[PDB]
Design a protein around this ligand. Structure first.
Ligand SMILES: CCN(C)C(=O)c1cccc(N)c1
Ligand SMILES: [Zn+2]
Ligand SMILES: [Zn+2]
Ligand SMILES: [Zn+2]
Length: 459
């Protein structure tokens, strides 16, 4: 039970306005045949065009919402909309394109999908709210067959070319005209009452309905993301490495250790309240401070209300010492905080668009993150870059240009000249810091934080 059986029933009620007379009793096998595709009894890695909700979740990076609206059915122009915001008009002869024949539309579909997906996934999963026209339009741009590899590399083939009779992955498909072995899922099979807009609007106010196909495609994928990553959360699902995951996560751990260590040295807090992940370890194990942990899993719907996290009767006094909120997203941080908050607006291959302004951050695991909000940081200030170190000035064991920096807080810099070891460590730390910032993480601190207080920690 890993793939979706072609003999599973498909509820057809949502299809009967575009396809009147459609049988109520329908399997995926009969639906695929009706869509103009022939599976030929093939045991070659592609058992069904449609996939399970569990397979869709493992391949969330491949999700592309897709909707087709009858502009005027073999005789009428169709408006093809995608969750990329693209609308194409295909004539049978928010970007809006004029009507063109299928032979040129299919070229655009392949280019659009390849550019969107080459750095995200080895496939495409068309996410539908199936009414009929989208299913019957697939024969005009989709070819199916056995699982194949790219002509130019070892990746699985996602595109086909009728000009050269060859196959390509998303990276090598320039000039290709057919989508090859795509996957799809109909959200209407999950059990909903009412239309797409009424279900989407229950959870999201950011996607409006401009009455175009791409608006529906966007809403469909958003509703699917809400169902699979907001109301349902699965942290047992692992996702492959597609970018800087390892470096970003290592940088996050380095910056956390640096910032907390310096805050403890500068303001000598007697107690630290570490609010967040229940599997957390002390980021500064050698610190004197009374370290107290409070469990809160990453919120995936709305940011935690600080009143619920702290009140209703613990140290009780969160006002004592400092609070560390390392990726624990709250509505309004208290003034005595050290905060790392992911900015959902950041563009990257790890950060996918989400529900209600939120984003789906996929780095080893999938984390739906509530929308970034600047008002959460009103009691704090942005944490400035700095490098602090009390380690001995000693090289041990990469050429050198002397480092001059006001933010290298070391004994050598206090003494007037940065040593080679602390210059190498400063540059490595600055690289880790810039990686984490560009990855989308933002850092905030209590207003009284001042790196000038670190210089006297060397006596
Ligand atoms: C915004 C995602 N959250 C809540 C994290 O804690 C996280 C997840 C994966 C990687 C990293 N570095 C951080
Ligand atoms: Zn390739
Ligand atoms: Zn939405
Ligand atoms: Zn030094």
């Amino acid at each position: 039970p890993t793939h979706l059986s072609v003999d599973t029933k498909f509820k057809t009620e949502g299809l009967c306005v575009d396809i009147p007379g459609i049988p109520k009793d329908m399997t995926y096998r009969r639906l695929i045949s009706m869509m103009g595709f022939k599976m030929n009894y093939q045991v070659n890695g592609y058992p069904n065009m449609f996939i399970t909700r569990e397979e869709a979740i493992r391949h969330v990076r491949a999700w592309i919402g897709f909707d087709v609206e009858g502009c005027h059915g073999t005789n009428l122009p169709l408006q093809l909309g995608f969750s990329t915001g693209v609308n194409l008009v295909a004539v049978p002869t928010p970007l809006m394109y004029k009507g063109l024949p299928w032979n040129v539309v299919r070229i655009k579909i392949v280019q659009m999908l390849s550019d969107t997906l080459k750095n995200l996934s080895d496939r495409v999963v068309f996410v539908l709210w199936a009414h009929g026209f989208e299913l019957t339009s697939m024969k005009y741009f989709v070819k199916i067959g056995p699982e194949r590899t790219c002509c130019l590399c070892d990746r699985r083939a996602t595109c086909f070319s009728t000009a050269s009779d060859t196959y390509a992955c998303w990276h090598h498909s320039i000039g290709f005209d057919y989508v090859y072995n795509p996957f799809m899922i109909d959200v209407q099979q999950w059990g909903f009452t009412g239309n797409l807009q009424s279900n989407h609007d229950l959870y999201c106010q950011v996607h409006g309905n401009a009455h175009v196909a791409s608006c529906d495609a966007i809403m469909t994928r958003c509703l699917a993301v809400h169902e699979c990553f907001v109301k349902r959360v699965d942290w047992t699902i692992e996702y492959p490495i597609i970018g800087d995951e390892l470096k970003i996560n290592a940088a996050c751990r380095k910056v956390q250790h640096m910032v907390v260590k310096a805050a403890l040295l500068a303001d000598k807090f007697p107690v630290l309240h570490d609010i967040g992940n229940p599997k957390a370890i002390k980021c500064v194990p050698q610190a004197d401070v009374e370290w107290k942990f409070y469990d809160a899993q990453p919120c995936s719907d709305k940011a935690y209300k600080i009143e619920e996290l702290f009140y209703s009767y613990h140290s009780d006094k969160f006002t004592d010492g400092v609070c560390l909120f390392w990726n624990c997203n709250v509505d309004r941080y208290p003034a005595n905080s050290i905060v790392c908050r992911f900015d959902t607006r950041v563009l990257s291959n790890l950060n996918l668009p989400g529900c209600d302004g939120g984003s789906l951050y996929v780095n080893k695991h999938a984390f739906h993150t509530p929308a970034f909000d600047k008002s959460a940081f009103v009691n704090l200030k942005q944490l400035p870059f700095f490098y602090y170190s009390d380690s001995p000035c000693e090289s041990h064991g990469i050429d050198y240009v002397p480092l001059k920096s006001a933010t290298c807080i070391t004994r050598c810099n206090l003494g007037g000249a940065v040593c080679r070891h602390h210059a190498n460590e400063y540059r490595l730390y600055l690289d880790a810091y810039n990686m984490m910032i560009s990855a989308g993480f933002s850092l905030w601190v209590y207003k009284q934080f001042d790196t000038y207080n670190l210089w006297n920690t060397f006596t």
